[PDB]
Ligand binder design. Sequence first.
Ligand SMILES: NC(=O)c1ccc[n+]([C@@H]2O[C@H](COP(=O)([O-])OP(=O)(O)OC[C@H]3O[C@@H](n4cnc5c(N)ncnc54)[C@H](OP(=O)(O)O)[C@@H]3O)[C@@H](O)[C@H]2O)c1
Length: 340
Amino acid sequence: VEEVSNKQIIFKDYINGFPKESDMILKTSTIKLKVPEGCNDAVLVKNLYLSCDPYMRSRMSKLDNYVPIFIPGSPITGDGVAKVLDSSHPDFKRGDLIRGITGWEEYTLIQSAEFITKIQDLPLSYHIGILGMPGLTAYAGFYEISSPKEGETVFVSAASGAVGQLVGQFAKLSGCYVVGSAGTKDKVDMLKNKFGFDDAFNYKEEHDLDAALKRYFPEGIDIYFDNVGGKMLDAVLPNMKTKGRIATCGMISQYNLDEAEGVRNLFCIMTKQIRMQGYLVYYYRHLYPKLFDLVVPLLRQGKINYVEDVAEGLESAPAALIGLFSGRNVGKQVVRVATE
Ligand SMILES: NC(=O)c1ccc[n+]([C@@H]2O[C@H](COP(=O)([O-])OP(=O)(O)OC[C@H]3O[C@@H](n4cnc5c(N)ncnc54)[C@H](OP(=O)(O)O)[C@@H]3O)[C@@H](O)[C@H]2O)c1
């Protein structure tokens, strides 16, 4: 039984405002590469990829919190891809590749097993992106929540991100006219060139968001896929069509504010008869087969594209997570901990 070093990213303590790299601490611990005797229904894994996700910011402040907080002194946890080294669980065996909740470290003794699934060709990292939680988020928000119909107009914010880039391609599959906003020229070019968006604009260079939306949506928006909230959401509301739908997926412009911004155009919910509906992807896990059945053939034919941002090494993970809130990532942010 080899006992080896185990680098970990430890959560320091609760924060306010924007997260900093000193809120996460590199610690070198030790681990024996065997499931402990008397420790049952557990899986010991070597972590291969880690996902960086905006919701992780909310785990860094103590609040009624919608996701359980990080524990100070303990490793950051989140979605990852890992290889089973040893198992006391009947459904996992040495060599299996899994996806699910694991530790921000080289090796994790996963004690529940509820939060992991065995990986069924495509890049391993896809299982925490288009074939994982962000892909399921895009599928549930667009197809289940938004009720898209052929010919409808669709606006997507954070459109080059892990979720948004898929929403735009689903909208094209549905025969919709789709526009996205993103924060750099490169992201805007990628929206039109690889994600098949009909148009796109850099919201950071638009001094009048209402005017920008009217450029692209002269007769209004049928479906707004909201990833950002805040001023963008407020500009969208008067530009919705009657009976338009807003899929409230996230509001990343708010996650680092002590006081959330006021949204002032909600009267448009009445005047435009809008259905604004939020959702949490965990309540849609039963749709994973429907996601796979749709996107796996398209990926194989190269008819749907997925762009990832791969940070190299566990030590790069804190900066990769902080970069989400400045738009440093181009596509789905992942961390490569080890090859395998
Ligand atoms: N409901 C659910 O269950 C669920 C599940 C997963 C994700 N979500 C939400 O979905 C949204 C997108 O997630 P993702 O994983 O795809 O992240 P992502 O788009 O891959 O990365 C985050 C992006 O947010 C944009 N951003 C950051 N700060 C911003 C600001 N102040 N204003 C506008 N845009 C900003 C940046 O893109 P730009 O360069 O374009 O600014 C950045 O690249 C997030 O709000 C997340 O919380 C919800």
